Amino acid sequence: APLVDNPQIKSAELLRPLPLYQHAYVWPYVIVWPVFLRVYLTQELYDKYIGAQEWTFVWIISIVTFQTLTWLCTHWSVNLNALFTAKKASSIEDAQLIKVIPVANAGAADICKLVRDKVGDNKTNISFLFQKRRFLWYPERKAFSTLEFDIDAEPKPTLSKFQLSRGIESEDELKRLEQHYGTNTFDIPVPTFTELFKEHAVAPFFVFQVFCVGLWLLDEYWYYSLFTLVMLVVFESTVVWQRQRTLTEFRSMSIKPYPIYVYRLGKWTEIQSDKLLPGDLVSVTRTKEDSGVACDMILVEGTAIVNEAMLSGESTPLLKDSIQLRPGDAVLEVDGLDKNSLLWGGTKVLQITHGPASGIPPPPDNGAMAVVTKTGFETSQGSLVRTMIYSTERVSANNTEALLFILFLLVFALAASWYVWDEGVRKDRKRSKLLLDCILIITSVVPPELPMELSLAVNTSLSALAKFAIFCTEPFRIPFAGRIDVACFDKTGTLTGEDLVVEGIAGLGLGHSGTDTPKEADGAHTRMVSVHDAGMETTLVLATAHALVKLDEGEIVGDPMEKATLNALGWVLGKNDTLTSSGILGTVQIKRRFQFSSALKRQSSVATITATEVKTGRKLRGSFVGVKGAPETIMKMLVTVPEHYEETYKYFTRRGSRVLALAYKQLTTEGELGANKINDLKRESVEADLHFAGFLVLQCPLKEDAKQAVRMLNESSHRVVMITGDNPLTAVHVAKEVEIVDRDVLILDAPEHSVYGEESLVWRSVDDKIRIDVDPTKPIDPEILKTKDLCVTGYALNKFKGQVGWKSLLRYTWVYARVSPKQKEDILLGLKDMGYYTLMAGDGTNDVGALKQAHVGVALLNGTQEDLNRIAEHTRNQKMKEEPPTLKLGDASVAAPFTSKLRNVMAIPNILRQGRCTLVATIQMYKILALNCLISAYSLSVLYLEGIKFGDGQITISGMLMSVCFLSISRARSVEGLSKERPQPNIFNFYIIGSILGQFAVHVATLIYIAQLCDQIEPRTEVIDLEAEFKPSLLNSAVYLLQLIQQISTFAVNYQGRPFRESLSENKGMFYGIVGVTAIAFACSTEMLPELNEAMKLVPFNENFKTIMTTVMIIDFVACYVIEWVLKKLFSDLRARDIAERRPDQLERERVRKEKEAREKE
């Protein structure tokens, strides 16, 4: 049995701490250090080693580096921390620390300290905080587990327990609950500069840089090494300062407490929302701005209209109901028949209404009585916050490819050092000079400037991305954007505005036929009449059927959809229960209202009307009855059903747009009905016979940029999928409009008629004429999986979990509808565990688990360019002196590596358009560096053993050329428009290694040939000494010219231009230097300028040698290009993966569109 009983935790272990005396980085180094110290200090018989300054410095550095590595091993890994710092314990009575390991993809390893509480006389509590969860020890089960509440037990509690709950009394029980469950607080840490710098300073690359810099302190230079260390410290300080600033700008979040009424100790008291305990009786009222319900509550009395904007994703108000109507002694199941009564935390209560089981007096603020069940970090949004903060480690550019690259270079470095040391010991030279030379060889091959170059090449991309208002917190995730195989998308807020807008009034032509209405095959009217131009009866119904309440000051409370209808209609209500005055020019006062019941679906009202139409001059007045409802219920009350009633609303509701039916009745044609007769009117008399007005269609309006951005993503080698939380029909229609899916579509769900307790999954069509049944064993491959597309809903994902068909449902599906916040993370993890890199672009809180676990996660805020301009104006004005609404810095930008600020779907291609421009650079800085470094190894391994030396001017020219060409490579800007070809993803591949080895072999062969020819023409039989000054000779000129041509060629051939980044002819800083240096080299080779040869201490040349040298340089330059070209054409992987393989018809349509737009572009 596992020690920790939780699905997330893999394994645990009990530990006992040790003091500083017994640590593994103190104990071996306190008995070894004095032994060497005595020998160095007061032995005077140094026969073990000679005793020179460098010989003792080597022994100092070895022990210091061993101490540093032994200390850092406890910080790099936690298993070594458990092995070194602590020891294995026996049981709970002696353990003080515990080590917890999470599952493979749900966080990071940790060591947590145990806390013991002595609230009981003979009872104690053992708890440790892992990932801000209060794990507790239960002695009966001999295992740790999470806290348990009243609502969660293997016997489900009866309804009488919550119905008869009278709050919390008996103050000692209150103290027990407070000490056992804790306060309702979140307390996000927001780490400061010191811990960030400590975390940054123990990275392997910084330690490697510090060690490589400190190795140069071998008495050669005491002023050229401290300056580099100071520069490194300054750079690492400013990088972490920028990260801290851009992290505190966004991740700084807070939940403001608000006072509430609590029925504590049999009395209603004012209590801050920070201190709430399970079992408390809470009166819930209308919520304030930017503040949701503080805790998970279940209603007991009254009805509330809430806005589930953080679980469903939509903003359409719901109708929560109490549990008074349910009888006692009933099981409280949550999945069905009572999920309409649970009130989750973090949501906003739009309205509260009452339209005494426990004998409790009503609260003074006149809210709804409810019982809080779960509080703290165990609520529904507590898990969301936990997935925000601790879910995934930073990347920090310390991947295994860099380690393999460094080892691959270090192999050649060690080989060269071994060769040099063998020659030195054979020639019996001084050991100190040999150690100096070997240290130079070791630190010159493996590059100590690679992290600096990578950081510069990523920070320039950050500065380029900052122009389009995209701000990023983790800079080293930009290279991940180059290789993207699937792009996930949300539906509400990302591709479509979240608010519901009135499309207009439809079906006004029903009944009488004008013989010009555009119909369909099934005879459904499709005319869309704007709400601005409408008849008298329909606008009076639209202005009278609403349910709006005016307060004392004048604020209007209700569903915002009737506000958006009224302000478009131009009407306005006064302080009294009246509606005042487009083109209607009238007034109406209402008398009696009915209520939405969720069983009858009928909002009806009576009123007295007077309207004066202006276009025709007709006038109406008297009494009026307006009814708004669902079309099926309204249809029965019509006395004359029109000719095409059951087709128009069906066609409109199969498109995903919400539809409502409007009916009017004229009770008395002149004057009101009369006093007190409206009061006795019954629901079955008011809603008896009515007259049709029209269908009011509401929909979420599509953005103007979604189609173009999705088209540009699809026409590339990417693939676009949609993971929404809306209805299947609306998601299917939006996907069809945006061209995510263009074929016949089949959805996977339960039958559309509401069946509860039935597990039958059936394939359905949008037209609803195909009902192929299926069972969770295997989907049929040849027809359903191949001919028609798919749409898997969230009700079929948890029924397909673990089966063999699951691996087939993550490959042939493009949209997912009605998806819970956990299932989005599940889908993205399943896609990531197949080999595809992913990207998610969300807007809200319900997709945090998807934003965090995606490789590149963008969060789109809502704000136009004019708002940013006004914010800039306000900031400039307040800075000059030393007001506009701020951006909705919500919850998606907290958990996303990137954050847009412009509310555009085109911000997703642009990031991709930058990612390629980074990745293509990041590859070649690996290829250009290593090859150069490899050449340097040879140029210091067997060529240094020769008598060749270079003058100061030549060295300065080579260094300036190398520095300029290396600084020009990193700075790169993108090229507009995505391309069908994909860059090379990974550094370790047959193409890169083959090209590097081939070019290095060509360089080595050319150098060997020219050295043997130069020795052949004029032999040098004199002895060779390695400490002499520079001497001009023909070898010293030939080797230098060839080496300079090699340094030119490595930058000349290894450069990828037009399809991803800047062309070479546009990059002035590299091109001018390359052409100038190669012109200088060729001019010196062909002896055009006699003065130029003596300018750089270059000897005169024989006529026969000049031609063969020029030909060998030309052969080198040609072969270095030919080998790379043939390897790129043969053994390279740039094509699309199996998930993005477009069908031929789609490519044909793309070609037709391209040629048509090119033809009309003239």
Ligand code: BEF
């Ligand atoms: F708009 Be979503 F589904 F978060």
Ligand SMILES: [Mg+2]
């Ligand atoms: Mg959303």
